[PDB]
Each structure stands twice: as C-alpha cells, then as structure tokens.
Amino acid sequence: MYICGDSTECSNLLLQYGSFCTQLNRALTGIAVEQDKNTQEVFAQVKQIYKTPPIKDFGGFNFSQILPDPSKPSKRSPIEDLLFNKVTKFNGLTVLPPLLTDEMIAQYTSALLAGTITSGWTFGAGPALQIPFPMQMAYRFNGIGVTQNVLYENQKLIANQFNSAIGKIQDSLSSTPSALGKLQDVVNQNAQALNTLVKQLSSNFGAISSVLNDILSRLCPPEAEVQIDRLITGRLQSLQTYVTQQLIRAAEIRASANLAATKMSECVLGQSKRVDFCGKGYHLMSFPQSAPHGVVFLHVTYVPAQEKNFTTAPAICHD
Amino acid sequence: SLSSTPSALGKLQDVVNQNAQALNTLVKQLSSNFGAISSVLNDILSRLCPPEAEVQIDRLITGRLQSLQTYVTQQLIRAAEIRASANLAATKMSECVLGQSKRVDFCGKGYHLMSFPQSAPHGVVFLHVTYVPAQEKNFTTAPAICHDGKAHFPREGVFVSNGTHWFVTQRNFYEPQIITTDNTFVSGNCDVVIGIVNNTVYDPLQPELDS
Amino acid sequence: NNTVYDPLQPELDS
Amino acid sequence: FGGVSVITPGTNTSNQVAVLYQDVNCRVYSTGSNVFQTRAGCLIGAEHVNNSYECDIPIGAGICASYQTQSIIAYTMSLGAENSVAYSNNSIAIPTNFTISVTTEILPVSMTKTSVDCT
Numbered sequence: 001m002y003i004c005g006d007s008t009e010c011s012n013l014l015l016q017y018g019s020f021c022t023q024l025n026r027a028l029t030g031i032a033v034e035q036d037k038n039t040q041e042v043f044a045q046v047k048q049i050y051k052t053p054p055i056k057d058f059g060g061f062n063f064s065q066i067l068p069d070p071s072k073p074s075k076r077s078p079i080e081d082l083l084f085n086k087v088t089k090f091n092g093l094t095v096l097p098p099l100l101t102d103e104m105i106a107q108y109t110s111a112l113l114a115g116t117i118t119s120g121w122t123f124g125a126g127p128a129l130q131i132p133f134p135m136q137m138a139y140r141f142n143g144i145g146v147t148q149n150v151l152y153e154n155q156k157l158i159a160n161q162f163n164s165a166i167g168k169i170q171d172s173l174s175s176t177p178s179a180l181g182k183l184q185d186v187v188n189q190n191a192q193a194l195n196t197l198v199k200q201l202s203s204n205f206g207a208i209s210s211v212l213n214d215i216l217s218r219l220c221p222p223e224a225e226v227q228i229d230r231l232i233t234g235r236l237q238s239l240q241t242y243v244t245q246q247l248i249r250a251a252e253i254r255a256s257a258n259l260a261a262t263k264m265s266e267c268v269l270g271q272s273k274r275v276d277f278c279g280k281g282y283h284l285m286s287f288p289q290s291a292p293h294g295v296v297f298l299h300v301t302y303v304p305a306q307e308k309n310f311t312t313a314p315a316i317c318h319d
Numbered sequence: 320s321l322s323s324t325p326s327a328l329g330k331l332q333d334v335v336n337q338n339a340q341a342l343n344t345l346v347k348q349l350s351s352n353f354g355a356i357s358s359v360l361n362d363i364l365s366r367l368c369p370p371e372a373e374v375q376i377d378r379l380i381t382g383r384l385q386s387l388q389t390y391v392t393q394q395l396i397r398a399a400e401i402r403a404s405a406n407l408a409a410t411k412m413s414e415c416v417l418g419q420s421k422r423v424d425f426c427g428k429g430y431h432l433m434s435f436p437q438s439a440p441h442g443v444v445f446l447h448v449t450y451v452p453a454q455e456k457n458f459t460t461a462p463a464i465c466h467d468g469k470a471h472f473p474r475e476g477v478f479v480s481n482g483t484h485w486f487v488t489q490r491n492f493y494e495p496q497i498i499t500t501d502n503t504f505v506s507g508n509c510d511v512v513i514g515i516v517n518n519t520v521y522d523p524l525q526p527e528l529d530s
Numbered sequence: 531n532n533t534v535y536d537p538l539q540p541e542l543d544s
Numbered sequence: 545f546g547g548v549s550v551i552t553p554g555t556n557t558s559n560q561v562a563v564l565y566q567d568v569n570c571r572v573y574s575t576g577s578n579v580f581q582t583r584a585g586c587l588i589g590a591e592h593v594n595n596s597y598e599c600d601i602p603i604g605a606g607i608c609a610s611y612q613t614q615s616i617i618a619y620t621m622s623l624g625a626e627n628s629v630a631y632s633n634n635s636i637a638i639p640t641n642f643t644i645s646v647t648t649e650i651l652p653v654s655m656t657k658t659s660v661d662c663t
C-alpha cells in the first residue's frame with residue numbers, strides 16, 4: 001500500500017526487486033515485540049498481586065496520593081491521573097495495541113506499592129513478610145548510617161515531612177508542563193517520523209508525476225514503466241530510511257527500559273547504596289507511578305541539615 | 320532441567336538463528352532482477368551488446384550493492400545489542416562471581432550468596448546461589464522496651480514476642496534471645512517512643528557483683 | 531588528653 | 545483493509561488455527577462463528593472463556609490465546625495470584641527456616657564474525 005497503492009502494474013514491478021518487504025516487516029515486527037518485552041520487564045517484577053489493607057495505621061505516613069483512588073472508574077492514584085493528562089493512515093501505516101493495557105500496568109504498580117508499604121523489601125526476595133511501617137523505616141534509617149533513636153524520637157516530624165513532600169510533588173507536576181518532557185519527546189519523535197514518511201509520497205523523485213495513476217492513464221507501457229520505476233525506488237528508499245531510524249531509536253528506548261527495570265529492582269524492591277542512583281541524598285525508599293509510555297519514580301531520600309562545627313581528634317589518650 | 324527443556328537456551332539459539340537468516344537472505348538477493356532482463360551477469364553479456372549490456376548490468380550492480388549495505392547496517396545494529404549484553408555479562412562476572420553483590424535481583428532472585436560461571440556456545444551461563452527465607456511465623460512486636468523508665472532499643476535485632484515472653488532476635492532467621500543490656504542500648508525515656516512496652520531487661524553483671 | 535569513663539568501677543565499689 | 549494474523553498452536557500438536565482481523569469491527573469479509581470482537585481486531589475461530597490464565601500466545605489489549613482441552617481459546621491474561629498481607633501496626637513475620645536455591649541466567653557474549661568480498 002505504501003509503495004504501489006494497489007496499482008497492478010507497480011506490484012508486478014515490485015516483484016522484480018529483492019525481498020525488501022519481508023525485511024521491512026521483520027524489522028518492524030522485531031521492534032513491536034520488543035516494546036511489550038520492555039513493558040513487562042519494567043513492571044512485572046512481582047509474581048503476586050498484593051493488596052493494601054484498608055488504609056489506616058501507617059504511623060502517620062499518608063500514601064493517599066500514590067495509592068489507587070477507589071472512587072475512580074480507572075483505579076489510578078491522584079498522581080497518576082496528573083501524569084496521564086500531561087502526555088499528548090490509509091497508506092498502509094498502522095498502529096498496533098500494547099499487550100498490557102493501562103489497567104494492567106496500574107495493577108502491577110499498585111501491587112508493588114502495596115508490597116513495599118506492608119512488607120518492605122522482603123516480598124522481592126521470598127514471601128512477603130508483614131512489618132509495621134515505622135519499623136520498616138527504622139531499618140531504612142540504619143541502612144543510611146543513622147541509628148533508630150532518630151526515627152522513633154522524631155516519628156511525628158518525619159511523617160509530617162514525608163506527607164508534605166508528596167503533596168509538593170503532586171502540585172509541581174500539575175503546575176509545570178515541561179515536567180514530563182522526556183515522555184512527550186518520544187511521542188513527538190515517532191509522530192514526526194510517520195508524518196514525514198507519508199509526505200514522501202508527494203515526491204516525484206524525477207518522475208513526471210508523484211501519482212502512479214496519472215502515469216498509467218497518460219503514458220503507454222514503453223514509457224510508463226520507466227516512470228513507475230523511478231517512483232518505486234523512491235518509495236522504497238523512504239521506507240528503508242524509516243525502518244533504519246526506528247531500529248536505532250528502538251535501541252535507545254530499550255536502553256532506557258533496561259535502566260528503568262534495574263531501578264525498580266534496586267530502588268523500589270530494596271534499598272540501594274549507589275550514589276545518586278535512586279535520587280540525590282541518602283536513599284531510604286521509592287515508589288513507582290505509571291505514566292503513558294513510561295515509569296515515574298518518587299525517590300525518598302534523607303538529606304542532612306543544619307550542621308555545626310566541632311573540634312575533633314582521631315583518638316583519646318586515657319592512661 | 321537444562322537437559323529436559325529445549326527452550327532453556329533460547330537466548331543463545333536466537334542469536335545464531337538471526338545471523339543465519341541474514342546470510343540466507345543476502346544470498347537470495349542474487350536471484351533478483353532489480354528490473355534487469357536477467358539476474359545473471361553472464362546471460363546479459365552473452366546476449367546483449369555493450370550499448371545495452373552495460374545498462375542492464377548497471378541495474379544489477381546497484382541492486383547487489385543495496386543488499387550489501389542493508390546487510391551491513393543490520394549487522395552493526397545487531398552487534399551493538401550483543402555488545403551491550405557482553406558488557407552486562409562482564410559486569411556480572413565481576414560482581415556475582417568474583418564478589419558478593421547486594422544489588423537486588425541482579426545476581427539471581429533472593430539474597431545473593433555466590434555464583435559460578437559455565438561456558439556455552441557464544442555466551443556465558445551463570446548459576447546463582449541465593450538464600451531464600453522460608454516458613455515464617457507471626458510475632459508481636461514493639462520498637463522498644465521500657466525498663467526502669469529508660470527506653471531500650473535492640474542493637475541489631477528486633478523485639479518480638481510470643482504469648483507470654485519478649486525476646487530479641489536477628490531479623491532474617493528466628494533465634495530468640497534474652498533481652499539484656501548486651502543486646503540492647505539505651506536512649507531517651509519511656510515517653511517519646513510510640514508503642515514502647517513494659518518488660519525487663521536482664522543485667523548480666525548483677526549476679527556476679529552479688530556472688 | 532581526656533578521660534574515658536569506666537562503667538564497672540562504681541558497681542565494683544558499691 | 546488491514547493485516548491478518550494467524551494464531552498457530554505448534555503444527556506438531558495441532559492444525560487448528562485462529563485468525564485475527566486487525567481493523568474489523570464485526571462487518572467481516574470472511575466467515576463467522578467463534579467470533580470474539582476485541583480491541584486488537586476480530587478473532588475468529590477461537591473460544592472466548594471467562595477464565596483467566598497465564599499468557600501463552602499474546603494477541604494484544606489484554607488478550608492472550610492458547611490451545612487447551614480440544615480448541616483454541618481467548619482469555620484475559622492473569623497478572624498473578626492475589627496476596628493479602630496481614631498488615632498490622634504491632635505484627636511482624638519472621639522466617640524460621642530457609643532454602644538454598646540455585647537459578648540460572650543466560651547471556652549472549654558474541655556473534656558470528658563474518659566478512660564479505662564485495663567483488
């Protein structure tokens with residue numbers, strides 16, 4: 001349809017070329033399959049779907065903006081609704097559906113979130129083991145070199161700072177339109193490629209006309225095939241160019257997906273010590289949120305404050 | 320398991336199959352006319368005279384070059400994917416085989432203990448040995464023990480309790496121990512900690528001081 | 531130059 | 545117009561196939577019966593069931609197909625078993641046993657090295 005447009009004479013000439021259609025279809029299929037693979041590696045990190053308790057008794061820590069909202073027709077968190085609302089044919093070019101729908105992504109995301117809130121990282125290694133949320137935090141504090149005294153003595157302080165930070169994120173994402181530029185850019189690049197490919201159909205490529213039907217209605221075979229044969233290589237060149245660019249671009253997306261999957265395992269289903277890997281500051285924990293064509297992580301970190309100057313020494317001399 | 324399941328090594332077989340297909344597609348483009356009177360140069364030359372023979376050759380010649388450039392571009396892209404895999408494999412050997420990694424689900428699922436490499440055609444197979452917790456039991460807990468008005472926190476473990484007694488144990492494997500001054504440490508009073516419970520912390524010096 | 535507190539001393543004397 | 549996809553159990557097992565018509569909103573230009581109309585197009589020749597299972601041959605838009613006791617069926621894939629964790633502000637679960645498990649991971653390292661004489 002792209003090259004000949006159901007012209008019989010063009011098809012017969014297209015058959016004189018190599019198995020280019022086969023190669024183009026294999027390349028695009030390979031990309032299409034990979035895209036579902038990427039989605040599964042990033043989100044299907046948990047073998048069970050964990051449910052939350054009624055949302056109560058988390059020690060003052062409020063997860064309402066990141067947990068699914070039961071009143072909605074689509075069970076997404078308030079933050080996910082904001083993320084979704086921020087990201088914005090007959091020539092043989094079609095679009096295939098994803099294997100995992102937004103609803104299935106939402107279920108994996110809520111499973112991981114329910115899992116980390118009620119069992120910490122244990123669900124990622126073996127069975128989920130329930131733990132009071134504040135005790136989970138105590139361990140996360142030990143994990144950054146801070147004793148447990150700090151968490152319990154300041155539990156109210158910590159819960160309030162946490163709750164404040166989540167609220168700020170929801171407002172920040174709503175306010176700034178560039179906040180999700182990384183996902184919008186992917187969409188825009190792919191749209192441009194398709195909206196460039198369909199325009200090459202208007203090109204003559206040295207032929208008397210861009211349209212096969214005009215060549216055939218006005219010229220006789222000894223000349224008509226010559227003109228068709230220019231358009232036919234013109235259109236094939238455009239398709240090969242398109243496919244090559246999609247393969248390169250797909251590789252970049254795969255690299256991003258591999259990183260996203262790594263982060264979910266190390267930032268969401270554990271506590272990482274890799275510097276500035278799971279957000280700036282000392283990592284405590286993180287929570288995933290879904291977004292069109294991607295994943296958004298909320299990284300919770302500990303940042304030291306209000307330092308004071310003290311005199312020091314490597315050792316004390318006693319007796 | 321490896322002997323029984325033929326799909327077990329599909330990742331290496333897929334590489335082999337893709338490369339075979341590329342070569343077995345490239346050689347078939349030699350049969351194409353590309354608009355020429357014949358796919359064969361010798362037929363063009365034995366039947367046509369130079370003013371026309373070169374014209375026909377010149378179509379096949381760009382046809383074959385197009386096939387080769389297509390082949391090479393695809394091999395370069397594919398090679399990049401293999402390189403990324405190789406870089407990961409090298410990373411895993413350093414971190415999983417020549418060490419003990421704490422990266423979650425990086426060196427197998429579960430808590431990583433060790434791993435052993437095995438070779439395979441065109442690749443590497445790792446056997447990752449991990450520790451998986453089992454047979455958990457439910458216990459009552461608390462963040463601290465209130466002794467004489469002072470608050471006691473565990474040094475390493477977690478305070479747990481059965482129906483009548485409080486114990487302190489290591490987090491990853493139940494092994495209850497007496498709550499003592501050598502297992503806990505003190506900070507703050509029995510006021511600020513939420514959920515602190517009434518218990519007795521054993522003093523290990525007291526009986527020696529009296530004996 | 532400083533003093534390191536000995537936690538047993540007062541119990542040994544009491 | 546649209547693409548036509550053929551869902552095939554391996555031929556060493558069965559010669560039944562099901563066919564998916566990409567842009568048909570059933571309004572199909574071939575046949576009827578066993579028609580499941582979904583977002584991925586019309587799947588004709590498969591039995592839709594109200595069960596859910598692990599995905600085998602993916603179709604799209606939440607639907608997978610498989611060959612089961614015989615016919616080809618269409619189903620919503622399951623995302624996994626449910627697990628309600630007994631979260632409580634005073635309850636902790638602690639392992640009392642363990643298993644040493646060994647799993648495998650396979651990675652490609654190299655591809656065939658080839659060269660071409662252009663002449």
Ligand SMILES: *[C@@H]1O[C@H](CO)[C@@H](O[C@@H]2O[C@H](CO)[C@@H](O)[C@H](O)[C@H]2NC(C)=O)[C@H](O)[C@H]1NC(C)=O
Binds near residue numbers: 062063064
């Ligand atoms: C978590 O934070 C939200 C704020 O986003 C709280 O929402 C309030 O809920 C009460 C009771 O339904 C309403 O009267 C308020 O108008 C809501 N606030 C806003 C800004 O709309 C929610 O109650 C908090 N939950 C917990 C457990 O702390």
Ligand SMILES: *[C@@H]1O[C@H](CO)[C@@H](O[C@@H]2O[C@H](CO)[C@@H](O)[C@H](O)[C@H]2NC(C)=O)[C@H](O)[C@H]1NC(C)=O
Binds near residue numbers: 156157
């Ligand atoms: C860190 O400094 C703050 C001062 O900003 C201490 O107390 C908070 O003060 C602000 C401003 O008056 C209040 O809005 C907060 O509600 C106060 N926190 C609490 C828990 O009441 C804070 O206590 C200091 N940090 C620590 C660990 O002591």
Ligand SMILES: *[C@@H]1O[C@H](CO)[C@@H](O[C@@H]2O[C@H](CO)[C@@H](O)[C@H](O)[C@H]2NC(C)=O)[C@H](O)[C@H]1NC(C)=O
Binds near residue numbers: 481482483484
């Ligand atoms: C909680 O564990 C303690 C032991 O750690 C159990 O107490 C012991 O029970 C045995 C009989 O089985 C007695 O001979 C010991 O003298 C008891 N020890 C102490 C310190 O009293 C206790 O029964 C367990 N509680 C429950 C409800 O199972």
Ligand SMILES: *[C@@H]1O[C@H](CO)[C@@H](O)[C@H](O)[C@H]1NC(C)=O
Binds near residue numbers: 317532
């Ligand atoms: C304290 O300083 C003096 C020098 O003024 C030195 O001789 C002595 O060893 C130091 N330490 C102790 C414990 O006396």
Ligand SMILES: *[C@@H]1O[C@H](CO)[C@@H](O)[C@H](O)[C@H]1NC(C)=O
Binds near residue numbers: 466468517
């Ligand atoms: C035990 O509980 C009582 C209240 O019944 C409280 O006054 C007391 O401080 C608690 N702790 C100790 C060590 O007595």
Ligand SMILES: *[C@@H]1O[C@H](CO)[C@@H](O)[C@H](O)[C@H]1NC(C)=O
Binds near residue numbers: 057634
């Ligand atoms: C746990 O919740 C119960 C019921 O509201 C309450 O009585 C108890 O004091 C709470 N314990 C802690 C540590 O928060």
